[PDB]
Each structure stands twice: as structure tokens, then as C-alpha cells.
Design a protein around this ligand. Structure first.
Ligand code: NA
Ligand code: NA
Lengths: 437, 434
């Protein structure tokens, strides 16, 4: 679950690619995906640019073959040369093809060697079927090496196309052992082992996730024994780090070294580069800085993001004295290429600036929010609602007003997303404080 | 081991009205109570005798002389089952009992009560706002104060003997909430997918004693749901109550959890749960919910019942599908509508019972709302009366949530109210003392 490689496409790229590869005439088509890479605990290919080969530019197109010109390999190499990007050829299901110049044709093998000669990097060849599922093979030194373990698109719904898929195996439904089998192959990152984060982490561990990253610098103490799952008085009296405490708890619960404690703030190279390995991010730190870092990790490394927060404002009523003003929670799902936490004003530059220049809490509210947060991931991997998951991109609930509201992704304005799929380009996350010094 | 005097909301409303008619003069009443003598003494208000003003010789702002034939009538009511008799007077509380021939002071009257019925008796005072304080008398002589007088209505009221006058009621989610919980006992029926989450919250909210009732064990198949369970617990088939009680001991650094390794349908479980100040029912069986129902009414304990369901169906095209994903939270106050009234169970369903996946996210969603409900009723923080939220139904598949007011629920006659441990226990001969 930790070292399997991945090819990640954005929903918007995948939709364009699927339309191009399946126009409706049942004939093969061709396209080229240019990808950045993350190479930490695993190889992750990050789809960045898409070149569609126009049908009229192809010498021929049939139900099981296509011939397209080699100038398109040159166009892909032009895009990839500077940053040694990975180049993935993609064809409609059957996948037979050749690349022709004026003088010579190149087989699939010859074309992959040609790609390597133009750009020293891992390249690949991928196939898509009409439904959109994708399989991919990687070429090292221009030669066939290994299949991609997982091709994934995290859109409104989240799709996992595994290399070991069974032919007559239907997708599992939510809350079943087939859900567990999926999660067992995935890595989850919990940013903040907090009131909400310890609960998200607990659910993630017991749901069967295969690797669980825990990122937090804080420690157990008497004041948070009312909230932090698995914490003990002995932990508090020694100020045991939260990540070490919870990592030990997970190893006892699951009986295996699946927890990865990161004793640091998310605003660190250690944390960012660990988190980049994850297949899903849960942000549970109640600071504007933390949510922005989580936001930028999600976009840069194409990781779906679930951000959760709760608030209990209070005020002094002239008659009764102090009063609970409201009891609220918020869940935000962010897909790569969809609206960001910034777009949603979960943070702003001014709020982060004022935060870095310079309130009751309760387990019941934390659990109410954390349960909804992990349920949102389940619903998007294994749809079970009567409405499209897109309708529930944002969730706002109030236990005092006893109301719950949902915001559709389509209602949210999107700014230009410059960091999408840039991976670990320095300065990391565009922040000099995280850059290689 | 802190004693308690528990009144139903209906009896307290009636008592408050009688003691404060609006003329500012004292009034007198007599509460006849059954008892539960377990870890703590619990006085269960059963009958209330209101002394008519017109039959009182004198009623003033700080004194009342009322006839003693009512003391004799209360003794008659209490004689058969040696019920406890609590005299109640309006705030100031000065009084005398007069016959046709003699007057008796408060001390003499308390001694007369003990001569008429060999049992614990008491004398109580209510202020206009409804708060109550009480003193118990043993062998007709002053003994100890009542640590807690409580009424679990739509709002739950705790009137502590150690109350400070300038001190204000705490608000939800504060240390003053913890201070209240530290004095209370909570019983969790079922350390289940929901029950382990309820118990976890109850422990970390600071409850003083936590009773855990369950006969089931940790297994590999429930390591995906039972909080604090470990692979070692599954290997050793560890009783859920023992597992969680040990967890609580380490979490709190204090042995505050009592493991009852048995089914709720047992004398051991019923008699243990009767000590609790609040019942959380988290067993998904009709029998368990009926037993919890009858404990709540018999021993005047507020009850929170929680259940979740994930129906599935086979769609012709897609195959197996999730039909719905639902949760239910029911708050039951003593003398309010019961789980039976709400059709949470029926006699037919229990008979057939003793003749659908699950997931931690749904369990946690329901268990969190369940415990939040108790907090809201002890420390109101909502923008509408708590009565509006007597029942909660939510669907995560339809993405809807609905709330049912107590006033929408028709009630049957409630005959077990405050009967305590009258045999056969809970009216079930299978739970009687052979
Ligand atoms: Na976008
Ligand atoms: Na009733």
C-alpha cells in the first residue's frame, strides 16, 4: 500500500481524453499525456499537459489500429525536454498503432525508445476502454519495464483502476469487504492528530487503510485528554507526542507497521514530502496556514483533500450571561483541478499573515464532524447517495440552529490553478521557506 | 454512593404549582416514594398528596399549620410496602401539624412518620423557581442531606446539595459541565459499534462512574468498529466490557468503569443499570430496547436509544445496491412517551425475535448525536426547545434529517413508572427471584 506506483489524471483531463478516444465511430484514436513526477516513497506520475492527435492527421484509423505522424512525438518531446517530464502515449482500447515519418514507420517498441532518446526519463504507453478505465505500462531506458499498479482519477467520484482487476468482478458497494480491499491498497495522510484528526485517524485505521501517515508536532496533555482518541493519563503526564501515541495505537489495533508518524508541523519539508505520497489528505488542523499548505499539497501532487473544522462561538447575553452563540461544523471536499479551499475563502492571504504575525471544544462535535468527513470519502469512492456527489462538495451544519446546508461545486468560482500537477518543483509549494536552501 | 431524590416532570410541575399558587404564602405537600438501594440510595417519587389550602389553619409567607390527618393518610398509603415519606414545603418551610387536640413540631412529625412506617423519611423545601433541597431522617431523627434532587424532563435538572448561590449554571462544553458529569453515573447497554463510541465519549466527558453491560466479545470481525479494541483482544476473545473498562482505567488513570459481563435481559444487568443517572441503549435488538425502556420508567432514569440501519437491495441492472443509510436517536424522559409508544419495538417483534452492512462512520455519526442530545438537555444550547428534538431521524443517502416533537407522540398508560425493583423485576417473571 506504500510503495505501489501511480498514474494520476485530473478529472478535466480524463474527460477530454475519453471524449477524444471514443468519438462514437468505434475507431481507435491517439493522444499524448505529458506528466511530472513525484519519487519519494513511490513513483507518482502527475498528468500536466494533454496533446490530442487530430483524427484527420492520422494516415488511417480503424477499429483495431491507427497510424499517426512522428511529428507528434516531437511535439511531446518539445514540451517535456526542459523539465525531463514523462511522456505517456494513450490509445483507444485495442491499442494497436504505429508512428510514421516520411521515410519510415516505427513500431510501439521503437517509438518508446525514440521517446527515451529525446527525453531521459520514464515514459509509458496506456490504453483506455470506452467506460474510461485505463491501464498503463512503463518503459525504463526506452524498454518495457513494469505495469502501473494504479491509474486513478479523483473527480466528483473517485476512480481506482487497478492492474490486478478481475474481468467479471463488479465494483464493490460501500461498507463491504470490497471497500476494505480497496482501502488496504491506499495511503491516507492525517494532518493534525487533533480533536477531529484523532477521530479521522481512528476511522481510517479501522476502515483498513494500508498506510496511515500522521503529521503533528503537538503532544498529549491533561487539557486534551477529553478529546484525543487512544490518549491516556500516562501519555499526558509525560507529554508524549501525539503522532507517536497514535502510531503505537494503530500498530496495536491493526497488528502491523502501517502507521508513519511525522513529528513536525505540516509547514515543513519533512511533512510535505511525506504527505505527497498519500492517496488522500485529511486536514484537521485549525489554522489558516495549515489549510493553505494542505491545499497546495493537494493541487501540486493531485491528491483528493478533505478539510474539516468545527466552531463553538460564545457571547455574553446581558440577561443570562455567557451564552453559546452557535455550534457549527464544516466539511470541504477538494478534487484536483476543482475549486480549492482558497477559492472557497476557507483562508485568505490576510488571515494567514495576521495569524503568523501574532473557545470551547467537545468530543461530541468533533465526532459529528469527523464522522461526516470520512463518510464523504466513502461516498465518493463508493457512491450510495440519491444525489450526485458533486452536490455535497461543501457541507455546513449547525447543532444549535439544527440545520444542514450543502454547496455544489458548480456554484464555486475557480481562480487560475498554477500549481496543479507541478509536484515537488522548488521552491516546494511555491513557498521559499520550504525551498531547498 | 451519592443518594438521590428523583421526581417525574409531571409530579414536579404539579408540586411547584401547589407550593407557589401566587399569593406568596407557604403551602404543604407529601411525596410518597419507592426506593432502590443499590450502590446509592434512590428515592423514586410515586404519589403526591397535596394539602388543600382551605383545610390549613394558617398560611403565611413564612409559616403553615396544616392538619395531621394527611400525615395519617400518607402513612396508610406507605404502610404496605414501607414507602418513604417526604414532607415538602414552600421555600421558607416553617410548619406545624395540628390534630383536633394537639400540635406537633417538625421534629415530632418526623418521629411520627417513623413510628407509622419503619423506613427512611425526609423533609424537603422548594423555592419559587422550582429548585429543591431535601434532608433524610433515619429512625425519625435527622440524618443526612440529599446529595441530588433531579427532574429529567424535556430539560434535565440537577439540584445539588453543595450548590453555591452566586454560582450560575454552567453552559455546555465547559469545565462546569465536567463538574456535573463527575458526580453522575452513566450506563452503556451494549459496547457495540455505537455503544463503544458512546462509552468513549462518556469517559472523556468526565462521567464519575460508567457501567458497561454486554455479553459479547472482541473478534476479528468487529475490530473495524469497537473503539479501544486491539488484535490481541480479538485473539483472546476478550469480553467487550472487560476490554473497555480497562481502557477507561488507563484513559482516566482511575478505575471508574464497572464491567457487567451479561446480557441486559438478566437480573445482574437490570440491577446494575438501575443505579445509573442516564441510560444509553446501543443494542440492536427489540428485546434489549424493551428492557432499557422498562428500566428507565421503573427507576426514573432518562434514556437515550440509538440505532442505525443500512438496508440493501438487488437492483436488476447494477445488482446489489445500498437502499438507504439511516440513523435514529430517541430521548425518553420518565413519564414521557416511551420507546414502545414510538413503535421502536412491539410485542410481536420481540416474540418473533426470540422464537445489512455496518461501518464506523455511520456508528460514529449516530453515537455523537446521541451523546450531544444528553448535553443539550442538561445544558441547553439550541435555538428551539429541546422538546422539539425528542426523536431524530437522519438519512445519509437521501441527505435529509427530521426531528419529531414529544407532543406528536401519543402515550399509553404508564403503570411501571417509579415502581423500582418490584418483583417480578420489570414485570417479567423470567427476571423474578424464584
Ligand atoms: Na480548475
Ligand atoms: Na406519560
Amino acid at each position: 500500500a506504500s510503495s505501489g506506483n501511480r498514474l494520476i489524471l485530473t478529472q478535466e483531463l480524463h474527460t477530454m481524453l475519453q471524449k477524444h478516444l471514443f468519438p462514437g465511430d468505434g475507431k481507435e484514436a491517439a493522444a499524448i499525456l505529458i506528466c511530472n513526477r513525484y519519487e519519494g516513497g513511490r513513483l507518482k506520475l502527475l498528468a500536466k499537459e494533454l496533446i490530442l492527435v487530430p483524427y484527420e492527421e492520422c494516415k488511417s484509423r480503424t477499429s483495431d489500429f491507427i497510424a499517426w505522424p512522428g511529428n507528434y512525438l516531437e511535439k511531446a518531446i518539445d514540451v517535456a525536454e526542459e523539465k525531463s517530464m514523462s511522456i505517456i502515449l494513450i490509445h483507444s482500447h485495442p491499442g494497436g498503432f504505429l508512428v510514421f515519418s516520411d521515410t519510415a514507420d516505427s513500431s510501439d517498441m521503437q517509438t518508446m525508445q525514440s521517446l527515451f532518446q529525446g527525453v531521459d526519463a520514464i515514459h509509458g504507453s496506456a490504453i483506455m476502454i470506452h467506460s474510461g478505465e485505463m491501464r498503463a505500462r512503463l518503459y525504463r531506458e526506452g524498454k518495457f519495464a513494469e505495469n502501473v499498479e494504479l491509474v486513478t482519477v479523483a473527480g466528483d467520484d473517485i476512480h481506482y483502476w487497478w492492474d490486478d482487476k478481475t474481468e467479471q468482478q463488479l465494483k464493490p458497494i460501500a461498507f463491504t469487504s470490497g471497500m476494505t480491499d480497496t482501502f488496504q491498497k491506499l495511503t491516507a495522510a492525517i494532518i493534525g492528530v487533533s480533536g477531529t484528526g484523532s477521530i479521522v485517524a481512528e476511522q481510517v485505521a479501522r476502515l483498513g487503510f494500508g498506510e496511515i501517515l500522521l503529521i503533528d508536532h503537538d503532544h498529549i496533555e491533561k487539557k486534551n485528554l477529553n478529546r484525543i482518541l487512544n490518549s491516556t493519563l500516562k501519555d499526558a503526564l509525560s507529554h508524549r507526542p501525539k503522532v507517536d501515541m497514535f502510531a503505537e495505537a494503530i500498530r496495536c489495533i491493526r497488528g502491523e507497521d502501517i502507521s508513519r508518524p511525522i513529528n513536525n508541523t505540516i509547514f515543513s519539508r519533512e511533512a510535505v514530502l511525506a504527505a505527497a505520497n498519500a492517496d488522500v489528505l485529511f486536514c484537521c488542523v485549525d489554522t489558516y496556514l495549515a489549510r493553505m499548505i494542505a491545499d497546495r499539497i493537494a493541487s501540486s501532487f493531485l491528491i483528493p483533500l478533505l478539510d474539516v473544522g468545527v466552531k463553538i462561538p460564545t457571547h455574553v447575553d446581558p440577561d443570562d450571561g455567557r451564552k453559546i452563540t452557535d455550534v457549527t461544523g464544516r466539511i470541504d471536499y477538494v478534487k484536483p483541478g476543482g475549486s480549492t479551499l482558497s477559492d472557497r475563502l476557507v483562508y485568505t492571504p490576510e488571515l494567514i499573515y495576521r495569524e503568523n504575525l501574532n473557545a470551547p471544544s467537545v468530543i461530541t462535535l468533533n465526532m459529528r464532524a469527523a464522522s461526516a468527513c470520512v463518510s464523504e470519502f466513502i461516498a465518493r469512492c463508493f457512491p450510495f447517495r440519491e444525489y450526485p456527489n458533486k452536490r455535497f462538495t461543501r457541507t455546513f451544519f449547525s447543532l444549535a440552529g439544527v440545520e444542514e446546508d450543502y454547496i455544489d461545486e458548480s456554484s464555486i468560482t475557480q481562480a487560475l490553478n498554477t500549481r496543479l500537477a507541478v509536484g515537488g518543483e522548488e521552491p516546494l509549494l511555491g513557498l521559499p521557506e520550504l525551498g531547498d536552501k
